[PDB]
Design a protein around this ligand. Structure first.
Ligand code: HEM
Length: 152
């Protein structure tokens, strides 16, 4: 798990996201979709997005970005004690949305990329390390639920 010091960094970094949850949410999804087109196909409500221009101009995409980051933030604030918050998400994404754990890896890297892109020189080595560990814990706990379900 993460140390108290690492959790403090994680939530300090998250402060950046909460100042513009919609903007960060939108960029994360755009980075995910442009970098891994196959992911777009998992969203029937975003498959109509042919170009990045259409993506950036989609208010619903920004809306979902907020839903996604608000959920992740709630989980992060639990500092590891997220069984109740994480279980339902793991279940919906494996059973309903059919999202391979690989796509969670993609969005994890996307979050790291967007933080550096929006806050160049303001996302330190220590901060990236803490945030990375938090995202891996998240991904690892979901992976456990995925194995339980036998979802690949
Ligand atoms: C940081 C990781 C993620 C979080 C916190 C997250 C969160 C959410 C939340 C809170 C919902 C609505 C409630 C439910 O349907 O569970 C949702 C829906 C959904 N998610 Fe995720 N998600 C994540 C990653 C992904 C990834 C990587 C994909 C696939 C590329 C994905 C695909 C979907 C789809 C297809 C829906 C349903 C959208 C709709 O039709 O309205 N999610 N997600």
């Amino acid at each position: 798990g993460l140390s108290d010091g690492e959790w403090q960094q994680v939530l300090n970094v998250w402060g950046k996201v909460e100042a513009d949850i919609a903007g960060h949410g939108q960029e994360v999804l755009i980075r995910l979709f442009t970098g891994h087109p196959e992911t777009l196909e998992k969203f029937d409500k975003f498959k109509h997005l042919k170009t990045e221009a259409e993506m950036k101009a989609s208010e619903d995409l920004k809306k979902h970005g907020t839903v996604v980051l608000t959920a992740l933030g709630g989980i992060l604030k639990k500092k590891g004690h997220h069984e109740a918050e994480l279980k339902p998400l793991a279940q919906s994404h494996a059973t309903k949305h059919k999202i391979p754990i690989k796509y969670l890896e993609f969005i994890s890297d996307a979050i790291i990329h967007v933080l550096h892109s929006k806050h160049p020189g303001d996302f330190g080595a220590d901060a990236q390390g803490a945030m990375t560990k938090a995202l891996e814990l998240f991904r690892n706990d979901i992976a456990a639920k995925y194995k339980e379900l036998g979802f690949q």
